[PDB]
């Protein structure tokens, strides 16, 4: 195991060496991380943000890995589970907070946070299928969050939390449907803010068939009775931009990101004002 990590990074670095030395520079070199985990079980999932590694197991067992510091390694122990439950699918970590999200095949959804360590069932979705779940980096990390809700019937749900380090704690608190995909499950909803304005953010969903574009607002006055307020005009106006996937012979399962540079061209736009993110 750990001579074979070893030998398996000096093997990747020469192979970097020997494409360039052959050929011209790869610009991207690919090496595999030492981590010296003794797991029988297989790898289904996992996540790299906010300076931690996460490797989601077949048998819901949950890695930490500091990505600075990769001996730092935070294992996490489950409770036993039967082999009906499944295994993880999908994973969010949030790229500016420790806090973990887990999905897995049967809809379940776990919040995992190292103040505890060990994750916890959401009570309010015991009933509904959600495939994905995420939060908006669109605001600080100091106070209220806003929570994406991914479902797998294509009903996008959105609420503004109160940071408490378990967010599996709430009430379902100022969480209401803000935009319905009647066309295909959501694989996820990522967003970030939107640089023109201070209070202003954007959405996008991702399903197995479309893609749809939302904006929302991330002011303060709308944490609480705001929120609601604002949820309801976006869901009245029915304006999202919308593309489609053709379903051919695939899960169709896909990730949302964000590219925060607009100091190159971009041969559609190239005006004086240049959008970031």
Known sequence: ??????????????????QLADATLPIFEVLPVQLQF?????????????????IALSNGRILRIDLNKPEDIDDIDLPKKPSEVGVIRRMFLDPTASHL???TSLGENYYLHSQSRQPRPLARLRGVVIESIAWSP????????????GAADGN???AYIETSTEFYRRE????????KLPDGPITGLWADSLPGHKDTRRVLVATSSRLFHWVGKIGRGHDSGGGASIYDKLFEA???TVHALSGASAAAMSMLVV?????????RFREDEVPER
Do not use: H, W
């Not at 379902?172 to 935009?179: F, N």
């Open 1 to 18: 195991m750990a001579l074979d990590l070893s030998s398996g990074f000096a093997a990747a670095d020469a192979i970097a060496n020997l």
């Open 38 to 54: 003794s797991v029988a079980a297989d790898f289904v999932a996992g996540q790299a943000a906010n300076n931690v590694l996460v």
């Open 101 to 103: 999200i887990i999905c």
């Open 138 to 149: 669109a605001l600080p990390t100091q106070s209220t969050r806003e929570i994406l809700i």
């Open 156 to 158: 996008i749900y959105e």
């Open 172 to 179: 379902d608190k100022y969480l209401k449907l803000v935009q």
């Open 238 to 240: 029915e304006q999202p």
């Open 259 to 267: 590219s925060p540079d607009a100091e190159q061209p971009s041969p």
